[PDB]
Amino acid sequence: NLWVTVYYGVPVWKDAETTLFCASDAKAYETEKHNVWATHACVPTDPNPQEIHLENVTEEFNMWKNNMVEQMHTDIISLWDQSLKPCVKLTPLCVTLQCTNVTDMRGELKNCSFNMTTELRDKKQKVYSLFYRLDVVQINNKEYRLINCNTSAITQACPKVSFEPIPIHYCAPAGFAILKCKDKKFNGTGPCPSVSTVQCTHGIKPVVSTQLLLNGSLAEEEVMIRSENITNNAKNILVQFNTPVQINCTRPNNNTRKSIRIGPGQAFYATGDIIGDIRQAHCNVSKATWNETLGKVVKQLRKHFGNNTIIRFANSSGGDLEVTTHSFNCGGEFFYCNTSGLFNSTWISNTSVNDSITLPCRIKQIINMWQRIGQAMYAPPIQGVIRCVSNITGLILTRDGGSTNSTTETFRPGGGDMRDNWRSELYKYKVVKIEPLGVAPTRCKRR
């Protein structure tokens, strides 16, 4: 009896992948400071982002299969190179370094004398600088060299731009949509009872860190435990905190900028003498706040590893510095902190057997993150003492393979892949494409 009829705009979608753009909230642009991080031409965010809750809908999510992570990961990487392209390349810094021990703590800093090319190509320049032990390597008084020269080339980051993370909303173009999981407890896998849609994702700060998720999103009620394959010890375990952890990372060295001239037109910023406290970089964590969280977190692992079992914590096993330490950026400088003091504990079924704690941190200006070869970035010196306060919102953890599985299990800080850091904020999001065209049988026919 009936007849076919074309309906346009029916609620039908399929899971797919597209190219997502950013959103800066149109305030980051007023923050200026010559293109901070991403925001330059960055899409300002709709003042009123729209979130529509879909009733009577259940959708299955997988955060580990999420494509927004891979795009974001490649975005930061592509973003990094574009920042270093217009800046000043440090290529003729491979000159011999004659170094000596700084005036305590086994001479971590080296005072190095070397020859340099001036604006003119005729006469050289005899000048000295100050490099960390991590930035230099001796070759056989004490003679050193740049640590990256044998591996690759090097370029200096511009002092105008800042590495300051700013909120970035990922949005989808026309024909696409972004799904948001509104449940309080979600491990990133399984069906999602309450699903809402948004044009733009929430504020996401691209904070690059290791062993500690900084400035991230808090969980709801109970703390969350996420892992790709849990019984598998080869897979990292992502944790989401309820309450934020106060962390202080400072640069207890009050410095000055040389701004030496290697012209014509170019000026390099050398690290001058340190005026102030003679100290190594340090990281503070309040003993009461970390413990309280630990007691709550260690109980969540027993929802899997069993009601009663012994959970012991320990510092990093070994590997690259990026893996073994907490790597991040504060005030433009890159800190590498020793977390061994926090991870020293042993817990009972519900319990573990002072007013403050500190963590030794190391500073490295010349870095290759993401296993990049051919390009090394030099972090420019900062005037004065740098102080920063951030939230610790989560961790990257790995389980040991030694078993004795039915006895006890030990967990250690993870590292490596930075996608996990983005999976922390993107677990509730996935990309689907909308299929508007539809057909239905009805009597109307046509004349």
Binding site: V4, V6, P11, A41, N56, A174, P436
Partner: protein, 130 residues
């Protein structure tokens, strides 16, 4: 905005206009662009208009020539989801609906462009002469 996706097809016909609007047009709109990350905010919106005109051809070449809803002279085959009328709109949902028609979807498409607007417009030419 997609709110009736969980609801029945009968209820999903009321908010049909909303999906048409938001889906159709999406301009932020920002002129600024750069050599890298400017090509990223381009490649996305260029694919948007390519996917769009792809849909619009079907609306024109079929018996619609207009948006939202339009009808046709193609009779509904029994072999295509033999059902009850109240079992479709009142008791069933679109996602659940498109699930079954997946086999006959390409067949119906042929009936719209060939059996109608190819043979209908020609029929019209023969009926408009007298």
């Amino acid at each position: 905005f997609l709110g009736a996706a969980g609801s029945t097809m009968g209820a999903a016909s009321m908010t049909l206009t909303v999906q048409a609007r938001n889906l159709l047009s999406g301009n932020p709109d920002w002129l600024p662009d750069m050599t890298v990350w400017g090509i990223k905010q381009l490649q996305a919106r260029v694919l948007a208009v390519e996917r769009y005109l792809r849909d619009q051809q079907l609306l024109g070449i079929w018996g619609c020539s207009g948006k939202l809803i339009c009808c046709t002279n193609v009779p509904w085959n029994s072999s295509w989801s033999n059902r009850n009328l109240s079992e479709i709109w009142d008791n069933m949902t679109w996602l659940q609906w498109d699930k079954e028609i997946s086999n006959y979807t390409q067949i119906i498409y042929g009936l719209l462009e060939e059996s109608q607007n190819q043979q209908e417009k020609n029929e019209q030419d023969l009926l408009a002469l007298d």
